[PDB]
Amino acid sequence: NTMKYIKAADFQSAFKAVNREILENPQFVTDSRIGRCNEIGSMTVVVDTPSSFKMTDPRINRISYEYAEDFWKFMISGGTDAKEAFKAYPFNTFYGPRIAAQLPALLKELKEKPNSRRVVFQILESSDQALLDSDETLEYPCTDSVTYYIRDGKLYTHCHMRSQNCAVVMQLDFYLQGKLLHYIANECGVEVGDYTHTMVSAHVFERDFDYVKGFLD
Amino acid sequence: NTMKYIKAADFQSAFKAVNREILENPQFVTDSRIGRCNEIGSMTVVVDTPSSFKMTDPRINRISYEYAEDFWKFMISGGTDAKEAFKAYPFNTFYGPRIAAQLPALLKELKEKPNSRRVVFQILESSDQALLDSDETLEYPCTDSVTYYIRDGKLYTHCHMRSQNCAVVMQLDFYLQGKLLHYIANECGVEVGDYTHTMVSAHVFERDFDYVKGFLD
Ligand SMILES: Nc1ccn([C@H]2C[C@H](O)[C@@H](COP(=O)(O)O)O2)c(=O)n1
Numbered sequence: 001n002t003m004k005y006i007k008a009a010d011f012q013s014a015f016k017a018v019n020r021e022i023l024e025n026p027q028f029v030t031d032s033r034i035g036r037c038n039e040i041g042s043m044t045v046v047v048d049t050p051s052s053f054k055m056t057d058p059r060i061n062r063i064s065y066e067y068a069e070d071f072w073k074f075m076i077s078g079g080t081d082a083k084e085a086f087k088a089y090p091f092n093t094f095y096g097p098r099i100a101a102q103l104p105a106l107l108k109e110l111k112e113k114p115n116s117r118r119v120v121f122q123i124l125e126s127s128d129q130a131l132l133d134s135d136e137t138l139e140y141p142c143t144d145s146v147t148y149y150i151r152d153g154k155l156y157t158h159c160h161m162r163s164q165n166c167a168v169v170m171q172l173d174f175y176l177q178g179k180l181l182h183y184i185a186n187e188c189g190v191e192v193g194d195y196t197h198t199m200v201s202a203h204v205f206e207r208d209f210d211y212v213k214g215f216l217d
Numbered sequence: 218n219t220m221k222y223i224k225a226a227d228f229q230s231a232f233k234a235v236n237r238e239i240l241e242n243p244q245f246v247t248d249s250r251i252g253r254c255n256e257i258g259s260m261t262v263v264v265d266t267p268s269s270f271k272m273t274d275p276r277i278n279r280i281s282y283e284y285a286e287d288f289w290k291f292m293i294s295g296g297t298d299a300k301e302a303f304k305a306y307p308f309n310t311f312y313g314p315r316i317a318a319q320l321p322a323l324l325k326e327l328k329e330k331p332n333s334r335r336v337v338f339q340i341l342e343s344s345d346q347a348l349l350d351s352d353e354t355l356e357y358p359c360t361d362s363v364t365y366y367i368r369d370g371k372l373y374t375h376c377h378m379r380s381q382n383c384a385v386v387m388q389l390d391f392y393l394q395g396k397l398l399h400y401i402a403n404e405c406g407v408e409v410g411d412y413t414h415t416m417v418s419a420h421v422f423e424r425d426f427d428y429v430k431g432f433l434d
């Protein structure tokens with residue numbers, strides 16, 4: 001039966017378990033906007049040790065960590081010049097500027113209101129709906145929001161994904177989300193608890209099945 | 218140990234299981250913005266049969282269904298005059314007008330783009346952050362977003378809650394979310410699949426423990 005809740009010690013184990021389950025026990029096999037995929041709706045993934053956001057298996061190589069680190073610097077710096085930022089790799093929907101806008105208010109709430117439930121970074125917003133009936137290629141944000149809260153000296157993170165390509169782009173999302181929760185934790189002078197990753201659509205495209213089978217076992 | 222994933226046949230069973238688990242196996246016991254509570258972070262709840270949104274146990278009575286139906290009419294009508302709407306019960310953050318604004322674009326995507334992953338109603342948005350450092354009493358939206366998708370003739374729903382009072386207001390949230398997914402399903406001419414309810418903070422205030430113990434068993 002389809003397992004929808006996956007607890008793992010580190011990002012890699014979570015990553016492999018999620019991919020394994022979508023390949024073997026999908027909820028849907030479906031034609032999507034960009035091709036056929038196996039899909040599991042409303043997957044919940046928990047990572048016990050979120051300092052583990054750089055995975056170690058070199059066979060998971062479709063997102064290089066040279067690229068992922070360049071992407072991190074690009075998005076934490078809140079820049080808009082992606083053409084220049086990625087020239088070594090061949091209205092906007094960049095996450096960086098949105099995180100930058102919300103940082104002062106959210107950090108204030110997080111540091112000053114004890115045990116707050118209100119610290120939510122919006123990534124996807126309703127103004128992005130102008131992309132739906134368009135022929136633009138801009139990303140309609142796959143990340144819906146990231147919630148942070150501090151209890152008893154520890155920072156807990158919940159990233160809610162509208163849409164997640166679990167074989168490829170999830171490698172990048174994990175890296176970026178891991179870096180960001182550590183940035184937030186360091187700013188607040190607290191330690192890290194755990195990380196939770198929900199995805200309304202958790203999918204692997206059929207064109208990537210062989211790649212996935214390459215890093216399982 | 219704290220159970221964070223709860224699958225139930227109907228809303229009531231889910232409702233009772235969630236409350237039971239927060240009372241008996243909380244992750245945190247914490248001082249919040251509005252008093253002490255038991256709390257479980259990143260709870261995931263699945264309801265198999267979402268037509269069951271009106272629960273039947275009369276002991277769960279802090280949200281009357283007379284009130285809940287009045288609230289439904291108020292929010293689906295996209296009104297702003299809550300003073301008049303609720304005169305029988307003693308910038309805005311109303312959900313209704315936000316749902317109304319997004320309905321045309323989201324319905325279009327849902328009906329016209331097959332197997333879309335993009336149909337997300339934003340409730341909580343970053344402009345609401347102006348409430349954080351304020352002395353207004355307006356609700357800072359507890360509901361983050363509601364995602365809808367259709368596969369093989371069935372409508373699936375994922376409601377992501379930033380913050381959920383599981384003993385009291387969850388009775389209202391379930392009713393409203395149940396009515397809305399059926400409104401959406403009927404508009405699209407499709408049947409209903411299942412409903413998923415994630416809550417970054419799932420909590421019961423200590424002042425409501427006796428009320429909860431009243432409807433368990
Ligand atoms: N941060 C991101 C951005 C995008 N995507 C992936 C998910 C989908 O495979 C595709 C988005 O397509 P759609 O808008 O149809 O969901 O990109 C992702 O996994 N993570």
Ligand SMILES: Nc1ccn([C@H]2C[C@H](O)[C@@H](COP(=O)(O)O)O2)c(=O)n1
Binds near residue numbers: 118356360382
């Ligand atoms: N639709 C809603 C609106 C509000 N709340 C509850 C959750 C919290 O108990 C409180 C919001 O407080 P805070 O902003 O501190 O999370 O109201 C809820 O459960 N459901």
